[PDB]
Design a protein around this ligand. Structure first.
Ligand SMILES: *Cc1cc2c(cc1C)Nc1c([nH]c(=O)[nH]c1=O)N2C[C@H](O)[C@H](O)[C@H](O)COP(=O)(O)OP(=O)(O)OC[C@H]1O[C@@H](n2cnc3c(N)ncnc32)[C@H](O)[C@@H]1O
Ligand SMILES: *Cc1cc2c(cc1C)Nc1c([nH]c(=O)[nH]c1=O)N2C[C@H](O)[C@H](O)[C@H](O)COP(=O)(O)OP(=O)(O)OC[C@H]1O[C@@H](n2cnc3c(N)ncnc32)[C@H](O)[C@@H]1O
Ligand SMILES: *Cc1cc2c(cc1C)Nc1c([nH]c(=O)[nH]c1=O)N2C[C@H](O)[C@H](O)[C@H](O)COP(=O)(O)OP(=O)(O)OC[C@H]1O[C@@H](n2cnc3c(N)ncnc32)[C@H](O)[C@@H]1O
Ligand SMILES: OC[C@H]1O[C@H](O)[C@H](F)[C@@H](O)[C@@H]1O
Ligand SMILES: OC[C@H]1O[C@H](O)[C@H](F)[C@@H](O)[C@@H]1O
Lengths: 573, 573, 90, 90
């Protein structure tokens, strides 16, 4: 018997653990995946010395733990098999493909991660706040009270993730790009560092945050926490929550232990589902919420008719640029050069403190030292200079989020012919109108690898504002990137495969009133009708948003925990 | 102060730990990489439920931890940059490339893995014995005593790795391929399962062996081993062994703790270097063995003049095939079919025990059940049927090793249009003559990511037998694969990039006499001249071999440990 | 004059090509010259270029032209995958 | 101007490519390291395949080409004939 059971060990589940273990609840957490990050359980995989010395190899870790949600049946024609080889007469259902899926109405890039820590073991760590325009209301009819509530929640979430905006302030490339974009949009747009869940430890090492940062996932009691009670159970697939006949209370969680193969029931006072935007919806549908199978309006769901509808995913555009000649030359604007590189007489100098200098002394020292120590190198930027981490946040006149820099998630072969110091990535993220017709649903016939109803999307970007903005966003990325340099061949401006962005929302959405706001949970993230069932994650988010959603989801989880602590008493120890 | 210090936590270092911790030595082990496999330290990364349900994603884990040894300067021409972008006038030294490296005399595919467990956290687990032709002598002038010694050693190594030849015996595809190849080469060649370091736990889960299997890398004393003494120190780069002035004894190991940044010296009675074929050679050269810098014969080395010479790497050829129509039809040879798939009347039947049946009842039951339960599927092979794991081992008349089946290390985009059940991989491995001119050496100017002398290869496959065999091996793979099916478009028969195979040998080679056998260690793997310095790994192997080398290296490590236990006394506890 | 494999999956009636051509400042240093050693297929002095797009106006305009093509083309439709905005080989 | 090309216009690119002979091709330095050991293998990037050793690959007009047929490049051209305005005109 536990006080609270949490399904999923991603950062949102760890938010619940942090708050409830700390408040003295007896907590169990289950994860279908396994411990995978070293001795820091659920930590960021990029925090090894080896990955921070070979960052271009990290894309492989990401790709290795993104398992595609819904792959349609393949119809590629191979007509150069040998006559002796067994040959298909039809495009039959092969290789785990989903026959329910329309290839033309998919989120083909959507994927899920089944490891302890969830997708926080690989994520970029970007944690912006949403402005009013992107954010669901927590207080009706009082914009100042709503602002104050979200400020309170986001402040606490930022502390849990160790969000900061200064970790890249000593990068030449960062400040080169930042300053040029500030000057070019003088008094039309503001630029700043991407807020990042991270702490810099040295000039060449950043400790990126994760689920581990939020809660260390060690079992409790232990020497550091002798009065706390927590157990993590990895390799456990959670399959169903059992409803009482009144549909007022959940009575148990049915699980499948993957190592013994056996099935069990787990009893708790409070049940929290933080399995991710797809897998929360799967578990709930498997439990008699929403509607199983291909949508059929003639059969209205008994419970939560909005579950799996109004789904949102962001449009994503991408390119890379090669820094302009003008920007490169500007890096060394304060240097006087005498003699010729490689000779005994070569001298690069600057006057420290000189009021005519364009750059601070620390910048000038770095550039001087690089040029004198590497006289065969043609660029003024030091070899270990960190990457840019630049944004202009979403605003009404540019309603997309932006990340400008270097991202470990590369989308094609990494090029080696252009110096990496010259390269700047551009990712612009659009917001998507929630529409009833956009759905995530689950097959009543086809099953996935864990023997659960197979996820199927029926999605297109809405006509009207969503589509108009997505194309305006593309243009904006072309216009803005040009201020820094021309496009890198091989990374020209493009829309990314739908869902690759992994910012899926609205699958179990939040609102004030189940019927009027077409929603599944209230503002304490409690499932309507049920006293002791709560849902956490981006699935809660009911709005059209362009910024990265995790911080917002954590803020909602914090608020849900306030509700729990005010309404359920922990067992005595 | 320790009794023994081991540099490297790969399977060969763990062999030394297993033997010496067990014998009561006070042991320290250092690894430049970090704990990365879950709570089983140094274990195989493929042993998660998720990877065994999504095996096509494991290639990403492999690629994510293969860091290229020597990348020549890039000379690709990009002439479609925007005029405003900074543009090179020369192909200057960019992106960590090695200017010492001749791109035409490289092992471009050679790579290293810096993680606790080393490359055993990702390897295929194939552990064949070498026959006489491929194997260095351990006893002179007595072929029967040599055979008995290697049998003893290999038997013990097989126990440490849990090598078996039966784990795939219940696979339809395995036995289909195996039986056809046996019939086709009747009395010319023998086929069997690839010997694999593994234990099957269920029909859909195999516990693949690793360094963890050999030694669990837990610190000791602990409850399970109260009288043993072992400490593992991850994130420690070992940089040099200090020689006494006599060059008779090593006095300390100089290390760089990567997390504090500080440097220390570690004292031990016995020093073992198991850093891998490349990094053992690097450490030794950094320590005044062999010759630093571009080879210069006019300056004979003081110590170990053969170090880094006589290097060997295997030629590798690869293709994939699509199973023949004839073989597929043969799977269902014992079935009687009535009616038509999908109808109420459809019936697939066989007579159990019938003396006219070609297959055992268990096979027939599987095929019957698949066909009745999946009447939309056009193939007779069950969806969860395991892959083939087939070999005909190296022999004088076919002097290459062979692995026929499914390998997680895919070399290109994984195709989805041909049913995976039809696909069979073919890898043939050639042996390479050891030649003085083939070298691994280390720059006296350029450094790698850990501030150590940069590895550089000077390698070509020797003219004569090596080259003749490599091309005959290619032909043999074409001839043999055709018996199973035609080539898969996209995986046509090809030589793989030099070194991709990662079977590098001979870098610190073994023999009886330093001078006469052009070698670095004797048959106890002791460095000539030095009482207390031993080298372990494939670098020891002095012969031309085609089979996978790890089992052989472990067998040599076992023998080296016998020497240690007979000549050094453990401290009292 | 198509520059890559011609696609067949999008209806050709929907497809519109965009080519924008910049002007280039004449500069003494930009040259076509002929080898005194190497000959071509007709046994004539081998042509050799020594060319870069001039810094200054030529280069500024070429990048502004790229932007202009992005801005204008967007009024008609989004880019065709496989034919994204690019400078062509000199 | 054949009936066949105006019914199959996507095939005309082949006529163009078939009569554009590259003016100056620099020496090639691509690394092929998967030849069979038995195949003859280069030790250097020597002057091969009619390449021009005088040409700097980084200061080229690599796409420049010439057409040697009666009618010259007018047997394949696009037929676009705008006037230059003052700004562009000698
Ligand atoms: C993969 C990715 C993700 C993000 C970024 C980059 C990359 C390449 N960058 C990023 C993100 N979000 C941001 O706000 N900023 C950034 O810069 N990414 C998305 C972010 O990573 C996710 O939004 C976040 O983790 C969501 O947290 P969560 O709601 O806790 O969900 P997770 O998926 O992380 O963890 C869920 C969890 O539950 C498990 N599981 C799933 N099904 C079950 C069942 N049935 N039983 C038990 N357990 C279950 C998973 O295994 C998983 O660990
Ligand atoms: C990567 C690969 C490797 C193998 C196969 C497949 C793949 C894709 N399959 C395979 C192999 N061998 C076989 O016999 N059969 C198979 O089916 N592969 C090769 C095998 O994996 C290696 O031969 C084997 O691990 C060698 O063992 P080792 O001699 O113990 O060396 P490792 O490289 O595994 O571990 C060395 C170790 O030391 C560390 N390190 C390196 N430098 C230092 C320094 N300077 N200080 C401290 N520590 C150091 C590494 O981090 C590493 O962990
Ligand atoms: C190939 C190309 C060219 C043009 C367009 C499209 C394509 C794909 N489109 C285009 C053009 N120009 C425009 O104004 N608008 C358009 O829409 N293209 C360029 C145009 O095609 C050329 O500018 C034009 O023909 C130039 O005319 P020209 O000065 O008469 O030169 P040509 O190259 O056409 O013909 C010269 C000619 O002389 C021959 N030859 C060369 N060397 C010798 C020697 N040594 N001895 C004797 N004869 C020689 C050639 O064989 C050739 O026929
Ligand atoms: O691939 C798209 C990704 O790009 C950036 O890395 C963002 F930080 C992230 O939130 C997102 O998932
Ligand atoms: O890539 C080549 C590889 O192919 C097979 O997997 C072998 F088992 C392995 O020893 C080798 O390293």
């Amino acid at each position: 018997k536990y006080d609270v059971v949490i399904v999923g060990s991603g950062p949102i589940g760890c938010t619940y653990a942090r708050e409830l273990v700390g408040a003295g609840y007896k907590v169990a957490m289950f994860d279908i995946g396994e411990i995978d990050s070293g001795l820091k359980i659920g930590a960021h995989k990029k925090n090894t010395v080896e990955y921070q010395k070979n960052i271009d190899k990290f894309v492989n870790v990401i790709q290795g733990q993104l398992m595609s949600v819904s792959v349609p049946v393949n119809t590629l024609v191979v007509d150069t098999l040998s006559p002796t080889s067994w040959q298909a007469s039809t495009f039959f259902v092969r290789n785990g493909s989903n026959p329910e899926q329309d290839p033309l109405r998919n989120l083909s890039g959507q994927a899920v991660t089944r490891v302890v820590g969830g997708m926080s073991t690989h994520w970029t760590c970007a944690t912006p706040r949403f402005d009013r325009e992107q954010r669901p209301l927590l207080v009706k009819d009082d914009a100042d009270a709503d602002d104050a509530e979200w400020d309170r929640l986001y402040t606490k979430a930022e502390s849990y993730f160790q969000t900061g905006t200064d970790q890249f302030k000593e990068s030449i490339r960062h400040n080169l790009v930042l300053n040029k974009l500030t000057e070019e949009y003088k008094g039309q747009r503001d630029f700043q560092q991407i807020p990042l869940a991270a702490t810099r430890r040295s000039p060449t090492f950043v400790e990126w945050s994760s689920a581990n940062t939020v809660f260390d996932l060690q079992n409790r009691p232990n020497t550091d926490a002798p009065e706390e009670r927590f157990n993590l159970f990895p390799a456990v697939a959670c399959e169903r929550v059992v409803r009482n006949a009144l549909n007022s209370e959940i009575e148990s969680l049915h699980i499948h232990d993957l190592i013994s193969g056996d099935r069990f029931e787990i009893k708790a006072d409070v049940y929290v589902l933080t399995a991710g935007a797809v897998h929360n919806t799967q578990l709930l549908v498997n439990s008699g919420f929403g509607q199983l199978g291909r949508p059929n309006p003639a059969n209205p769901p008994e419970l939560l008719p909005s579950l799996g509808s109004y789904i949102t995913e962001q449009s994503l555009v991408f390119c890379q640029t090669v820094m302009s000649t003008e920007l490169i030359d500007s890096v060394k604007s304060d240097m006087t050069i005498r003699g010729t590189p490689g000779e005994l007489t070569y001298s690069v100098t600057y006057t420290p403190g000189a009021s005519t200098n364009k750059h601070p002394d620390w910048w000038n020292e770095k550039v001087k030292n690089h040029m004198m120590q590497h006289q065969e190198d043609p660029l003024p930027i030091p070899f270990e200079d960190p990457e840019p981490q630049v944004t202009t946040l979403f605003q009404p006149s540019h309603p997309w989020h932006t990340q400008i820099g270097r991202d470990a998630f590369s989308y094609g072969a990494v090029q080696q012919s252009i110096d990496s110091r010259l390269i700047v990535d551009w990712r612009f993220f659009g917001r998507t109108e929630p529409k009833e017709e956009n759905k995530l649903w689950f097959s009543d016939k086809i099953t996935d690898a864990y023997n659960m109803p197979q996820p199927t999307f029926d999605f297109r970007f809405p006509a009207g504002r969503t589509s108009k903005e997505a194309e305006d966003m593309m243009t904006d990325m072309c216009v803005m990137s040009a201020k820094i340099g021309g496009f890198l061949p091989g990374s020209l401006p493009q829309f990314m495969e739908p869902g690759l962005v992994l910012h899926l929302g609205g699958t179990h959405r939040m609102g004030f009133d189940e019927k009027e706001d077409n929603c599944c949970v209230n503002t304490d993230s409690r499932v309507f009708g049920f006293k002791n069932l709560f849902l956490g994650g981006c699935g809660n988010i009911p709005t059209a948003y362009g910024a990265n959603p995790t911080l917002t989801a954590m803020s909602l989880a914090i608020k849900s925990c306030e509700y729990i602590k005010q309404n359920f008493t922990p067992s005595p120890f």
